Amino acid sequence: VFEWFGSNESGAEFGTNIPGVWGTDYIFPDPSAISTLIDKGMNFFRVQFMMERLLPDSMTGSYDEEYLANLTTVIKAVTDGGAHALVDPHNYGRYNGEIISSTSDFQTFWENLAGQYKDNDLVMFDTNNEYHDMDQDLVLNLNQAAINGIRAAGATSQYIFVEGNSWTGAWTWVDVNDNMKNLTDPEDKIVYEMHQYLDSDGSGTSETCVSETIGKERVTEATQWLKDNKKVGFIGAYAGGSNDVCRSAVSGMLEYMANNTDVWKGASWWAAGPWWGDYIFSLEPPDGTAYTGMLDILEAYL
Ligand SMILES: OC[C@H]1O[C@@H](O[C@H]2[C@H](O)[C@@H](O)[C@H](O[C@H]3[C@H](O)[C@@H](O)[C@H](O[C@H]4[C@H](O)[C@@H](O)[C@H](O)O[C@@H]4CO)O[C@@H]3CO)O[C@@H]2CO)[C@H](O)[C@@H](O)[C@@H]1O
Ligand SMILES: *[C@@H]1O[C@H](CO)[C@@H](O)[C@H](O)[C@H]1NC(C)=O
């Protein structure tokens, strides 16, 4: 049904201590859990990392090469298995607590990072996770700078996932992100990535979904925005509690998207990863709540 369909793999961005230490503060996704999701039919994994850990001096400085290697190990595990890996600096438009306002340093950051993966045609690049509370022109230029840096590295074959303001929410998209339609790419492989949760405030922090139909309701206008501006999109992060109302909401959002695959290239569940424990949305096999409680709904699209 969709071009791409799978899961986020979180953990490398975990914890409050920055840089912090592996095994205590954060961890990398587990290739064998990723293999199990691939065996279920998922062809897409969006792998979270923290910029401050990849780059402990400055945005344009030296890598922590052990952290980079680890990120690369997960990417090779995804791509070796034939799936696309979407590389997600999980940073909210910010670096070291401050809004990234230097388009130039951002462009440089993305040219270096894309340089690491330019030859892996199964890799995809997400410009940044959930920009918010920042100037809308800056968000536009930040995304263009990423595109420009990526292609300047010679990463010319890979799709580039761009995110908007208001936490790239689908439900607020037309209200704030209209200028994002002006992004250009010499290769023409821009995907508009939006997120959508189904609890009352859209924060994705409660199991309760507002209603059976709230998912469809929250992506309708964005769907129409994509059509009217002749772009394609993707739901990079979405979830609902393992309960009957949420199951219908999730089910119904995916069904509506499946009726509009001219614009929706697919979706990724928030989230899998080895340290979610009893997280309400965990899709980590063998016993994540979403893994046992929701996966059947997602398999209709696999
Ligand atoms: O650090 C070691 C310690 O970690 C505990 O695991 C914690 C993590 O420390 C913490 O980083 C992690 O934070 C999650 C948070 O719970 C989610 O609500 C949030 O999900 C957001 C997401 O970040 C947005 O971008 C997305 O789109 O919206 C979602 C939905 O709100 O994601 C962050 C991860 O980025 O939470 C873990 C708690 O479960 C371990 O439990 C502990 O044992 C370890 O010692
Ligand atoms: C990289 O992974 C290894 C485990 O394979 C670990 O010992 C190391 O601490 C990891 N991350 C970093 C930043 O070193």
Side-chain angles (χ1 to χ4, degrees):
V1 182
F2 297 115
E3 199 85 59
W4 301 302
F5 202 78
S7 192
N8 286 268
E9 294 286 342
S10 327
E13 83 298 1
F14 272 25
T16 50
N17 304 0
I18 302 165
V21 8
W22 176 100
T24 310
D25 291 295
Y26 65 87
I27 192 78
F28 284 76
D30 170 345
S32 49
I34 286 163
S35 272
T36 299
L37 292 172
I38 284 167
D39 211 322
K40 301 267 176 199
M42 289 186 158
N43 70 340
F44 182 102
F45 301 83
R46 174 164 181 261
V47 178
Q48 281 68 66
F49 71 102
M50 183 178 284
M51 292 167 72
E52 294 89 349
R53 295 187 178 139
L54 180 57
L55 293 147
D57 297 337
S58 91
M59 207 185 268
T60 61
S62 278
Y63 292 134
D64 174 337
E65 291 213 278
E66 204 170 307
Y67 187 93
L68 174 65
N70 290 351
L71 167 67
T72 296
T73 295
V74 177
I75 289 170
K76 196 253 207 320
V78 174
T79 57
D80 273 7
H84 286 84
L86 172 61
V87 175
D88 163 37
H90 216 250
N91 261 267
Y92 309 96
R94 285 156 177 73
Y95 178 79
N96 204 20
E98 299 298 337
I99 287 161
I100 299 164
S101 56
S102 176
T103 66
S104 183
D105 283 347
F106 201 53
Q107 183 167 327
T108 293
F109 155 75
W110 263 116
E111 184 170 10
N112 298 334
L113 179 58
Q116 303 302 118
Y117 301 119
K118 65 202 252 60
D119 283 328
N120 187 319
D121 298 323
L122 286 175
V123 166
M124 294 160 140
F125 305 106
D126 197 319
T127 72
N128 219 259
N129 184 80
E130 296 173 345
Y131 300 92
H132 67 83
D133 299 301
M134 55 193 283
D135 180 275
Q136 187 64 30
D137 295 312
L138 178 59
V139 166
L140 173 64
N141 296 328
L142 279 175
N143 278 265
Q144 188 65 243
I147 289 160
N148 294 343
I150 285 154
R151 304 305 194 207
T156 46
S157 76
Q158 296 89 345
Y159 291 89
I160 298 180
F161 286 52
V162 298
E163 315 196 9
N165 221 330
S166 289
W167 311 87
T168 207
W171 69 333
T172 51
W173 189 273
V174 307
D175 297 328
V176 292
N177 287 124
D178 194 64
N179 69 336
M180 293 283 291
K181 72 193 178 202
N182 290 313
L183 294 158
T184 55
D185 171 11
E187 309 305 330
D188 192 53
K189 288 184 170 62
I190 292 160
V191 191
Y192 288 84
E193 190 186 329
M194 309 179 195
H195 297 172
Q196 194 63 52
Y197 299 101
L198 311 176
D199 50 355
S200 58
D201 62 358
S203 61
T205 55
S206 159
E207 282 189 71
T208 296
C209 298
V210 175
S211 77
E212 296 179 291
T213 58
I214 198 64
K216 171 213 186 314
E217 283 152 34
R218 284 175 178 174
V219 302
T220 292
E221 282 187 309
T223 304
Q224 196 52 66
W225 186 86
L226 293 162
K227 291 180 180 287
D228 293 341
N229 295 281
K230 309 186 178 92
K231 322 295 195 176
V232 301
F234 191 83
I235 301 289
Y238 78 107
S242 296
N243 55 77
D244 290 300
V245 182
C246 279
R247 289 173 54 82
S248 292
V250 170
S251 173
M253 182 187 76
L254 302 175
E255 185 181 322
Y256 171 83
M257 295 176 54
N259 249 289
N260 288 277
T261 52
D262 55 330
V263 294
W264 295 115
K265 307 296 91 140
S268 31
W269 182 273
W270 184 267
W275 272 16
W276 285 116
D278 65 352
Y279 192 49
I280 49 179
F281 299 144
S282 169
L283 204 76
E284 193 75 341
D287 54 354
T289 302
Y291 184 77
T292 51
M294 283 287 329
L295 187 62
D296 58 317
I297 285 159
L298 304 197
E299 292 183 282
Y301 305 86
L302 292 175

